[PDB]
Amino acid sequence: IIGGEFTTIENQPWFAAIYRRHRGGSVTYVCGGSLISPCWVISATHCFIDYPKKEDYIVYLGRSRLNSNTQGEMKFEVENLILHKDYSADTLAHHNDIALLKIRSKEGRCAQPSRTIQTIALPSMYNDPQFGTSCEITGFGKEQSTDYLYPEQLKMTVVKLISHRECQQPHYYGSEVTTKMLCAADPQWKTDSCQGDSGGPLVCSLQGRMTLTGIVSWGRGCALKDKPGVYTRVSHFLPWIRSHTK
Numbered sequence: 315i316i317g318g319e320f321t322t323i324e325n326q327p328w329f330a331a332i333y334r335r336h337r338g339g340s341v342t343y344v345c346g347g348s349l350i351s352p353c354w355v356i357s358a359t360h361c362f363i364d365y366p367k368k369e370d371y372i373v374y375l376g377r378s379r380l381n382s383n384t385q386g387e388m389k390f391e392v393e394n395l396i397l398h399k400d401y402s403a404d405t406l407a408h409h410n411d412i413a414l415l416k417i418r419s420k421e422g423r424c425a426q427p428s429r430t431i432q433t434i435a436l437p438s439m440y441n442d443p444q445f446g447t448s449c450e451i452t453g454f455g456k457e458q459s460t461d462y463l464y465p466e467q468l469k470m471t472v473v474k475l476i477s478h479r480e481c482q483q484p485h486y487y488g489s490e491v492t493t494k495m496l497c498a499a500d501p502q503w504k505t506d507s508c509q510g511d512s513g514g515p516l517v518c519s520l521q522g523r524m525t526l527t528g529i530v531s532w533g534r535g536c537a538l539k540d541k542p543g544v545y546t547r548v549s550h551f552l553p554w555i556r557s558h559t560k
């Protein structure tokens with residue numbers, strides 16, 4: 315997250331921190347994710363497509379720092395790694411950038427809801443917030459595009475939703491951004507998601523309910539003028555989410 319504020323997991327309790335174990339035992343941060351039901355974390359396929367072995371992944375819930383075992387946190391392995399069958403990557407745009415991770419503790423259990431571990435509501439079909447609505451994003455991604463390290467403390471920011479017609483403008487993304495994608499950014503281009511924030515939530519308060527409207531997917535650079543963050547439009551994928559979580 316470029317700009318924004320440092321926060322803690324009690325403010326983002328649906329946030330999942332996803333890591334990968336390498337041969338030799340080293341563990342590194344991969345991407346963010348969101349808890350949609352006790353057994354299911356939703357994220358982005360581009361985070362896993364090059365290493366599609368479910369055994370390689372570690373998922374944390376209730377974790378506030380990158381290298382701290384936060385009080386109340388829960389650690390899980392991935393029982394099922396479900397990647398969207400028609401995923402593809404263009405120079406910038408990712409297509410069907412959505413993945414499901416069925417999680418399980420070493421005891422074979424799903425998440426135990428608490429003050430720091432909570433699910434996030436899914437949207438209803440054809441019901442997204444209007445353009446201009448403020449939504450929040452969270453993650454452990456880069457604070458600056460030139461950084462190679464990620465921040466130790468979890469960060470959040472607030473961005474505004476941008477219409478499909480505005481995002482398809484020539485100085486924005488043209489026809490590279492589709493109707494299955496949602497754009498959001500800072501009108502002053504000072505705050506945004508960045509590399510490392512992929513798979514994490516775009517949460518919008520809609521008709522009084524906090525909703526998982528988007529999943530961090532792609533963007534040209536980070537907090538670059540006329541280059542919004544692009545998010546998987548969760549409402550389009552409700553039949554795919556319901557069928558793959560059954």
Ligand SMILES: N=C(N)c1ccc2cc([C@@H]3O[C@H]3c3ccccc3)ccc2c1
Pocket residue numbers: 360361506507508509510511512530531532533534535536537538541542543544
């Ligand atoms: N401007 C943004 N909001 C934004 C949002 C998500 C991003 C995600 C990346 C990921 O590093 C890119 C990548 C591409 C292809 C495969 C894996 C990772 C880089 C820049 C990103 C920028």
